[PDB]
Structure 1
């Protein structure tokens, strides 16, 4: 049986090729995760179909209904067999789905438009002139929502009630906001994305300060999946063979335009 892979359109992990209009199936996409899916399928020996998550979300649980959305939801409800994307390994997710050992290490970071008077989270939490937010339905928003350390707690208090909303639907929306805000908006996103955007035209943003935490991305499968074990060993094998490092350089800096 062909394994249904759920993923998300997020550069440079998964993007439609320039000429996708004349291409079919998995051939329409390119990116780090597209190359990764290919390797994993090769080592685990299976056929697969790449599908883009319907609601375009990573995955969070509705507090009222307790229903999971995004890619996590597609796995939880049997709509997908595996998720290959920049999906963060977290406690709440690990309780409902399975994760392979990380294929990428990262942390939450701050994105600013070049020139804005911000050097750290501390600096953001001490002022109100510059607005800041995070992605919705993801691990980053949950990070601030559940943080007890002073600076991050203060930040959550501000963001949670901010008006207009400081939260965005997609990473692209958060980046666009930083770029057209004349420096009045700062975006909190994972270092991987931040570093990627920093090397792309118009080269007007930059990552400032160190990472707020240390975590990683993992390939997720539904609880009790027969693919879990093989995938996990496959990830380890690829990291050790150097493939993962190869892919990182291929999509991040060999393609950098700044």
Structure 2
């Protein structure tokens, strides 16, 4: 059958996909910039398809409801046929692999801690052993699910606190979490992926930092629906771009070449 424009789901998450300053006078894919916008263009070229970037309707990564088994976020879009591919900082997880396919990873990450500078916290164990400083994670993402299922005493203890914390310690978007750290006088710390932590650490006002080692070792993959023709070509594209140096170049472009903190 004839080639058709591929519907790409992605998420507004800096510096992966961001609105261009002048987006109001732009159309289509041209409205957007970032690592994943650059990566989509390269994947598309190698795979030989035309594509339309579409921001995920519900603004979520993807979680399955325990009772209903319904998926939301970008994972849901793939599962229910509203997108052909997800090119986003979407973490490869076993439960997600039940319902979608992931490419080999194009970027590594692990769960990490973001503090406001000066906060007397160096580690997850530190957080777990006190109550003065609140802490949380993003809703409907892999970090929250990590804590929910972890067996580890410290993380299990963190999860027991976070799940019942009031007011809620969970946030709707990464930017909300970062804003919360910045304005809570060191009484909130944020659990988020090292990639996003390390990005924000080099953004003005330069008042946050990453502390501790990463809690785990994971990757982002390009996701396609089960049985999609596209998966094979996508996986070869990722390997090619890795070997060409493109993944390294794009990481440096969007994290460090553009860093605002000296």
TM-score of the aligned structures, taking structure 2 as reference length: 0.98
Matched residue, 1:127: 130
What is the alpha-carbon distance in structure 2 between the residues aligned to residue 125 and residue 254 of structure 1?
Answer: 35
What is the alpha-carbon distance in structure 1 between the residues aligned to residue 28 and residue 151 of structure 2?
Answer: 45
Deviations 1:29-50 (A, max 9, x none): 0000000000000000000000
Deviations 1:105-146 (A, max 9, x none): 110000000000000000000000000000000000000000
What is the alpha-carbon distance in structure 2 between the residues aligned to residue 252 and residue 138 of structure 1?
Answer: 22
1:6 counterpart = 2:9: yes
The alpha carbon displacement at 1:147 in A equals 0.4
The alpha carbon displacement at 1:240 in A equals 1.1
Q: For residue 27 of structure 1, give the secondary structure of its aligned residue in structure 2.
A: helix
What is the alpha-carbon distance in structure 2 between the residues aligned to residue 160 and residue 214 of structure 1?
Answer: 23
The alpha carbon displacement at 1:256 in A equals 0.4
Alignment of 1:215-226 (within 5 A): 215-226=218-229
TM-score of the aligned structures, taking structure 1 as reference length: 1.00
Deviations 1:179-203 (A, max 9, x none): 0000000000000000000000000
The alpha carbon displacement at 1:247 in A equals 0.2
Q: For residue 206 of structure 2, give the secondary structure of its aligned residue in structure 1.
A: coil
Q: For residue 52 of structure 2, give the secondary structure of its aligned residue in structure 1.
A: strand
Q: 1:242 aligns with which of 240, 245, 256?
A: 245
Deviations 1:152-182 (A, max 9, x none): 0100000011011000000000000000000
Q: For residue 191 of structure 2, give the secondary structure of its aligned residue in structure 1.
A: strand
Q: For residue 136 of structure 2, give the secondary structure of its aligned residue in structure 1.
A: strand
Deviations 1:226-247 (A, max 9, x none): 0000001100111111000000
Q: 2:165 aligns with which of 148, 162, 166?
A: 162
Q: For residue 38 of structure 1, give the secondary structure of its aligned residue in structure 2.
A: helix
What is the alpha-carbon distance in structure 1 between the residues aligned to residue 15 and residue 95 of structure 2?
Answer: 26
Q: For residue 37 of structure 1, give the secondary structure of its aligned residue in structure 2.
A: helix
What is the alpha-carbon distance in structure 2 between the residues aligned to residue 190 and residue 232 of structure 1?
Answer: 23
What is the alpha-carbon distance in structure 1 between the residues aligned to residue 173 and residue 24 of structure 2?
Answer: 23
What is the alpha-carbon distance in structure 2 between the residues aligned to residue 153 and residue 11 of structure 1?
Answer: 29
What is the alpha-carbon distance in structure 2 between the residues aligned to residue 215 and residue 236 of structure 1?
Answer: 17
The alpha carbon displacement at 1:65 in A equals 1.2
Q: Please provide the CA RMSD for this pair.
A: 0.4
The alpha carbon displacement at 1:62 in A equals 1.1
What is the alpha-carbon distance in structure 2 between the residues aligned to residue 240 and residue 204 of structure 1?
Answer: 36
Paired residue total: 258
Matched residue, 1:208: 211
1:55 counterpart = 2:58: yes
What is the alpha-carbon distance in structure 1 between the residues aligned to residue 84 and residue 52 of structure 2?
Answer: 10
What is the alpha-carbon distance in structure 2 between the residues aligned to residue 192 and residue 211 of structure 1?
Answer: 11
Segments of 5+ residues of structure 1 without an aligned counterpart are none
What is the alpha-carbon distance in structure 1 between the residues aligned to residue 140 and residue 22 of structure 2?
Answer: 31
Q: For residue 58 of structure 1, give the secondary structure of its aligned residue in structure 2.
A: coil
